[PDB]
C-alpha cells in the first residue's frame, strides 16, 4: 503493498512577462515553494527550445543501480550510445509490465517502484547516465560554437532558462567565483530508464537546483521543505545508521532510497510531482529530494545561488564544520572576491554581499581576539586562494580555510581553522603562527566599496 501518494507540490504557469526573469520569478514564488521544498514550472506554451541530437554519436558509460530501500548508495562524480541505451530501456519496461512502453500508468510505475525497493525477494537492477556536459555528450540546450546555429537556436542561446546561462547571470552569486568548482557551475546530463533513481539528498552548500526534462517519459519527484531537513535526518538516522558514519571525502558520500510514507508517518512533510518533458523542477535551499524515472528520458540540471541564499550558504559552512564535512568552495573567499569586484556588481547583489561581509568581519575579529588570548602572537599574511583545496583544510573539521588558519613549524603544511587551535600539535601556542588573508584594516574599505556601489 500500500502506497499513499504524498500531496502534490505547487505548479506554476508564468506568463511571458513573469517568465522573462528567472531570478525575479524564483524570488516571487519563494514564499510558497520554500514551504514544499520543490515546485514545478511550466513555461509559456511558445517557449520551446530546439532539441536536436544524433543518437548514434552520443556515447556514455552507465552506472549500475540495485533498487533496495535503506541500502547505502554512493553519490558519484559497459558503454552505450543514446540509441542502444534507449533500446535496452524500452525493452526492460515493456518486459517488466508485458505492456507497450507508453501504456504503463504512472501511478502503477510509482506503486511498483515502492513495492520492488521494499521486497527482499526482488533483485531488480537498472542503469542510468549521469555526467557534466563534454564533447562525447553535450548540453541539451543551444550553446555558442566556432558550427553555424539556426535562428531557432539563436533565440534560446541567451535565455535565462537555458541552463548554461543561469550560473553566469548578474542575479547569481556563483558567477564571479574564480575557483575550479566544475560540479556546481556546469550543467549535469541525466539519461534515465524505468526505475532509475536519485536517492534522498540536499545540494552542496544548500544551493538551489533547476532541472529541465528535455524529452521522454516523466520523472517522479518527492520533496521536503528546508525547515524539515533535521526532522528528516533524525528519521533516517534511526532507520539507517550506517549512512551517518564519517566519510574520508566528498567522493564517499552515502545516500539512500526511503519511502515517503515512512517520512509522512514520522510527521515529516513530503510533496510529490511527475515532471513531464518541457517542464522544470526547482529545488529550494536545504530541501531534501529523491525520485525515479517512469521510463527512457533525458534531463539537464544545474545548481545556482541567489542573494536570498547568501546567509544560508554561511549557515551551511558552519554546519559542515560541526559535522567535519568537506566544502566544495570557501564561502568567505567567494564573498571577498565579490567585494574586490564591487564596481561591476549588481546593486542588490552588492547590498546583500555587504551584509554577509559585516557578519564575516565581526566573527573574524572575535576569533582572532580569542586565539591571541591563547598565546598565539606571531602572524604572517598568506594568500590562501593560491593553495589547492586539499592543502588548506582544517586537520580537525575539514573546513576550507581562507580568512585565517594556525600553523606550526613542527607540522609542515598542516593547518587548523581558528576554532581548532588546540588540535594542531602539542607545542605551546607561542610556537604558532597566525596565517591571515587580510588585516581588519584591509577588510573595512572592501566592505565600504560595496556600500558605495549599493547606494548608487
Ligand atoms: N554532484 C553531487 C550532487 C549530485 C546531484 C545533486 N542533485 N542530484 C539530483 N537531484 C535531482 C534530480 C536528479 C536526477 O534526475 N538524476 C540524478 N541526480 C539528480 C544529483 C550531482 C553530482
Ligand atoms: Mn528489492
Ligand atoms: Mn539534487
Ligand atoms: Zn608544533
Ligand atoms: Zn576547524
Q: What is the CATH number of the domain that holds 146?
A: 2.60.120.650
Ligand 1 contact via 190 beta carbon (within 6 Å) = yes
Angle between helices 440-454 and 331-339 (to 10 degrees): 60
Distance CA 284, CA 206 (A): 8
Ligand 1 contact via 206 beta carbon (within 6 Å) = no
Ligand 1 contact via 128 beta carbon (within 6 Å) = no
Q: Are 450 and 350 in contact (CB under 8 A)?
A: yes
Distance CA 308, CA 290 (A): 24
Q: Are 220 and 306 in contact (CB under 8 A)?
A: no
Ligand 4 centroid – CA 424 distance (Å): 7
Q: Are 79 and 60 in contact (CB under 8 A)?
A: yes
Q: Give, using CA atoms, the residue closest to atom 22 of ligand 1.
A: 77
| Probe residue for ligand 1, chosen from 195, 209, 303 as the CB with the greatest number of ligand atoms within 8 Å | 209
Atom of ligand 1 nearest to the CA of 283: 11
Q: Are 220 and 293 in contact (CB under 8 A)?
A: yes
Strands 297-304, 80-81: pairing kind:
unpaired
Ligand 1 contact via 130 beta carbon (within 6 Å) = yes
Ligand 1 centroid – CA 191 distance (Å): 12
* Domain span including residue 41: 22-311
Experimental method: X-ray
Q: Give, using CA atoms, the residue closest to atom 5 of ligand 1.
A: 203
Short-list 416, 394, 396, CA closest to 406: 416
DSSP H helix total and E strand total for the chain: 12, 19
Q: Are 160 and 22 in contact (CB under 8 A)?
A: yes
Atom of ligand 1 nearest to the CA of 203: 6
Q: Are 116 and 195 in contact (CB under 8 A)?
A: yes
Upper half-sphere CA count for residue 389 (Cβ side, 13 Å): 15
| Probe residue for ligand 1, chosen from 129, 188, 273 as the CB with the greatest number of ligand atoms within 8 Å | 188
Distance CA 32, CA 188 (A): 27
Distance CA 265, CA 235 (A): 10
Distance CA 300, CA 211 (A): 6
Short-list 208, 381, 188, 200, CA closest to 282: 208
Which helix (H) or strand (E) is 78 found in, with range?
none
Q: DSSP states of 281-306 as a string?
A: EEE-TT--EEEEESSSEEEEEEEE--
| Cell numbers linked to 43 | 513555461
| Cell numbers linked to 422 | 588546540
Distance CA 300, CA 296 (A): 14
| Cell numbers linked to 428 | 605551546
| Strand intervals (E) in 173-270 | 188-192, 197-201, 208-216, 219-223, 254-255
- Around Cβ 311, how many Cβ atoms within 10 Å? 14
DSSP 316: H
Q: What 3-state class would DSSP assign to 452?
A: helix
Strands 188-192, 280-283: pairing kind:
unpaired
Distance CA 50, CA 59 (A): 20
Distance CA 116, CA 423 (A): 48
Distance CA 421, CA 26 (A): 41
Distance CA 311, CA 334 (A): 13
Strands 297-304, 219-223: pairing kind:
unpaired
Q: Are 221 and 275 in contact (CB under 8 A)?
A: yes
Q: Are 19 and 233 in contact (CB under 8 A)?
A: no
Amino acid at each position: 503493498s500500500m502506497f499513499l501518494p504524498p500531496p502534490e507540490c505547487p505548479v506554476f504557469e508564468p506568463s511571458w512577462e513573469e517568465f522573462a526573469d528567472p531570478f525575479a520569478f524564483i524570488h516571487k514564488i519563494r514564499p510558497i515553494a520554500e514551504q514544499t521544498g520543490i515546485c514545478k514550472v511550466r513555461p509559456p506554451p511558445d517557449w520551446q527550445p530546439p532539441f536536436a541530437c544524433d543518437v548514434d554519436k552520443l556515447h556514455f558509460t552507465p552506472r549500475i543501480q540495485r533498487l533496495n530501500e535503506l541500502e547505502a548508495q554512493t553519490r558519484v562524480k559497459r558503454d552505450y550510445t543514446l540509441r542502444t541505451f534507449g533500446e535496452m530501456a524500452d525493452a526492460f519496461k515493456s518486459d517488466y509490465f508485458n505492456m507497450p512502453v507508453h501504456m504503463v500508468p504512472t501511478e502503477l510505475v510509482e506503486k511498483e517502484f515502492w513495492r520492488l525497493v521494499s521486497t527482499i525477494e526482488e533483485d531488480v537492477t537498472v542503469e542510468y547516465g549521469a555526467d557534466i556536459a563534454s564533447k562525447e555528450f553535450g548540453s541539451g540546450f543551444p550553446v555558442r560554437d566556432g558550427i553555424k546555429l539556426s535562428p531557432e537556436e539563436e533565440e534560446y542561446l541567451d535565455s535565462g532558462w537555458n541552463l548554461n546561462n543561469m550560473p553566469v547571470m548578474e542575479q547569481s552569486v556563483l558567477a564571479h567565483i574564480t575557483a575550479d568548482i566544475c560540479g556546481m557551475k556546469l550543467p549535469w546530463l541525466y539519461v534515465g530508464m524505468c526505475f532509475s533513481s536519485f536517492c534522498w539528498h540536499i545540494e552542496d552548500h544548500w544551493s538551489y537546483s533547476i532541472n529541465y526534462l528535455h524529452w521522454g517519459e516523466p520523472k517522479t519527484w518527492y520533496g521536503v521543505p528546508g525547515y524539515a531537513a533535521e526532522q528528516l535526518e533524525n528519521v533516517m538516522k534511526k532507520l539507517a545508521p550506517e549512512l551517518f558514519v564519517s566519510q574520508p571525502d566528498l567522493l564517499h558520500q552515502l545516500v539512500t532510497i526511503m519511502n515517503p510514507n515512512t517520512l509522512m508517518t514520522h510527521e515529516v512533510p513530503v510533496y510529490r510531482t511527475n515532471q513531464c518533458a518541457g517542464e522544470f523542477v526547482i529545488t529550494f535551499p536545504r530541501a531534501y529530494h529523491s525520485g525515479f524515472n517512469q521510463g527512457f528520458n533525458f534531463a539537464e540540471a544545474v545548481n545556482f545561488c541567489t542573494v536570498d541564499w547568501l546567509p544560508l550558504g554561511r549557515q551551511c559552512v558552519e554546519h559542515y564544520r560541526l559535522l567535519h564535512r568537506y566544502c566544495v568552495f570557501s564561502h568567505d573567499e567567494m564573498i571577498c572576491k565579490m567585494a574586490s569586484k564591487a564596481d561591476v556588481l549588481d546593486v542588490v547583489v552588492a547590498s546583500t554581499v555587504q551584509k554577509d561581509m559585516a557578519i564575516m568581519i565581526e566573527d573574524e575579529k572575535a576569533l582572532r581576539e580569542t586565539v591571541r588570548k591563547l598565546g598565539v602572537i606571531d602572524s604572517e599574511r598568506m594568500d590562501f586562494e593560491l593553495l589547492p583545496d586539499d592543502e588548506r583544510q582544517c586537520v580537525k573539521c575539514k573546513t576550507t580555510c581562507f580568512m585565517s588558519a594556525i600553523s606550526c613549524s613542527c607540522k609542515p603544511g598542516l593547518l587548523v581553522c581558528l576554532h581548532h587551535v588546540k588540535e594542531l600539535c602539542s607545542c605551546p601556542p607561542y610556537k604558532y603562527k597566525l596565517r591571515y588573508r587580510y588585516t581588519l584594516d584591509d577588510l573595512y574599505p572592501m566592505m565600504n566599496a560595496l556600500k558605495l556601489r549599493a547606494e548608487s
